[model samples]
Target: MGHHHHHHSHMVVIRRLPPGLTKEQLEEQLRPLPAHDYFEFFAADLSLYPHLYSRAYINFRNPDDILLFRDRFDGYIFLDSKGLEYPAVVEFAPFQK
Candidate 1:
């Protein structure tokens, strides 16, 4: 069975992002996580409300971090100072994008 391969991926999709979030804000939330880059998920979606749900593409510098990242960040949520709740969802990107 040529099913499994010895490979590691460094990309992940972090969904359920709350609106009004800034790159710096999310970066702060990802402290020392080796997050190399971030992409705006569902960019095509128009901002109907200032607080519409959102998602993101997080790029990790090290492949090894992927596993640990899922464990620590998958179910994490962003609770804004204004008392807004934005749950986080982390998943393997699979594709480079």
Candidate 2:
């Protein structure tokens, strides 16, 4: 086996972000938590129009933060610049890195 690396232990994936969202905006939503870092990218869509949904990788200092956030924000609606609403889905990051 390779050397141990389990950084995803406290990482979570936030899906279905609004088109006008930014890292700082996301941080504002999570301002109370001890988040360490955040990165995001467009998730694949099976439809012809892709990039409709984005995913965020949030690195929290503790797994408890993940649980707390998911408990509160999972399925929470996000508002875009145009006032469009999108439901957010939160899940644990499944990759080990």
Candidate 3:
């Protein structure tokens, strides 16, 4: 029997997001996973802090998805031909509420 009464209560925080992407594009990138509950992209504002960069917080309908996404993307780096790189940091986000 499945635990239908219980709901997944966790989210993944992805750091070091690459710049120059729109919200729609970001959403598209994450469309492959099952995160109908909560998925958000937090665009970085350099004016707020010097080291601040874009990030993402995604909550899945099931806890299993957390593991799948984290395993696939954690510490994943994206580099361009010019040597520009963006490293992704994925982990369970601290629950609030």
Candidate 4:
């Protein structure tokens, strides 16, 4: 006694990292990044998709970006902006490029 609906539409988010970090030491510490890093995500479809995780990246213009917290291999990685943590999201799409 249940009903379900499906749609073929697909949506994703693309994001970028602000300027420089092009050295070896910084790269290993920030595993999932590029000087200009970007990624994609799929929409939620609970019955058909079971694994989803949240990812966030912070950008700062006047200060240093560093690794705040790392646990074995996972945890909160802080992105400090202008000497403090900043949160401002910018959007990107492949087609728009």
Candidate 5:
């Protein structure tokens, strides 16, 4: 059952994106690691995926930075924050309805 209150403890995985890396490119980086997962997009503010856990938004500067949170994880894949639908933007939270 769903509730207004949320249970947030496990990290909502977020990757620090790299410059010039498209969405497909990011997926390629995370392909090798499945135990740890990745999402096609992320929230804008990252509140859902707090910075305390996600390095992507913590160090967000611009849309073209050359780094990603994926680097922190054990996976060799590096997903970039580009071409995402909405909150797909790094550090920014997806608009809530």
Candidate 6:
């Protein structure tokens, strides 16, 4: 028999992203913390719509980072180019297929 390890199971969802924010931009914002092993942007065609919002999924290498991310960023406000601040909604959930 073999045992399977489950460390990457912890993931966080970043919601209410600015309409035109890129993955790279957000990644930079998360700097100092370890980069997510996996990053996925929500499905949408930016060119097709205006005032659209996006979301993303991020996986952490360590479980500790997951807790820290939620504690430090959840409900934190981010300002977009328009000078409007939007709060980032962070939550933990098992990485979904």
Choose the strongest candidate by lDDT.
6
Q: Model 5 over residues 1-97: C-alpha lDDT tens digits?
A: 8877633312333434433433443444333342333445322332233333222322222322213343344233333353332222223333333
**Candidate 4 C-alpha lDDT tens digits along 8-36:** 22222213322322223223333342223
Clash pairs (backbone) in predicted model 4? none
lDDT of 2: 0.63
| Model 5 spans with C-alpha error above 4 angstroms | 1-9, 42-97
RMSD of 5: 14.3
How displaced is residue 58 in candidate 2, in Å? Answer: 0.6
User: What TM-score, over all chains together, does every model reach?
Assistant: 0.63, 0.61, 0.64, 0.19, 0.26, 0.65
Error (Å) of candidate 1 at residue 5 is 17
Judge candidate 4 at residue 96 and give its lDDT: 25
Candidates in order have lDDT scores of 0.63, 0.63, 0.63, 0.29, 0.34, 0.64
Kindly give the stretch of ten consecutive residues in candidate 2 with the minimal lDDT sum.
41-50
Ranking by TM-score: 6, 3, 1, 2, 5, 4
Candidate 6 has an lDDT of: 0.64
Question: Where does candidate 1 clash, by residue pair?
Answer: none
Where model 3 places Cα greater than 4 Å from the true spot, the runs are 1-3, 42-52, 79-84
**Model 2 C-alpha lDDT per residue in residues 1-96, reported as the tens digit of each score:** 697654444667777665555556565664356655665544332233254555566667656667777889888877755665767777878867
Score residue 67 of candidate 4 by CA lDDT.
Answer: 23
* Model 4 local distance difference test score: 0.29
Off by over 4 Å in 1: 1-9, 35-54
| TM-score, predicted candidate 2 vs. hidden true structure | 0.61
RMSD of 4: 18.0
Residues 9-95, model 1: lDDT tens digits:
467787666565566666566544764555554432123435455566777665777777778887776776666676777888878
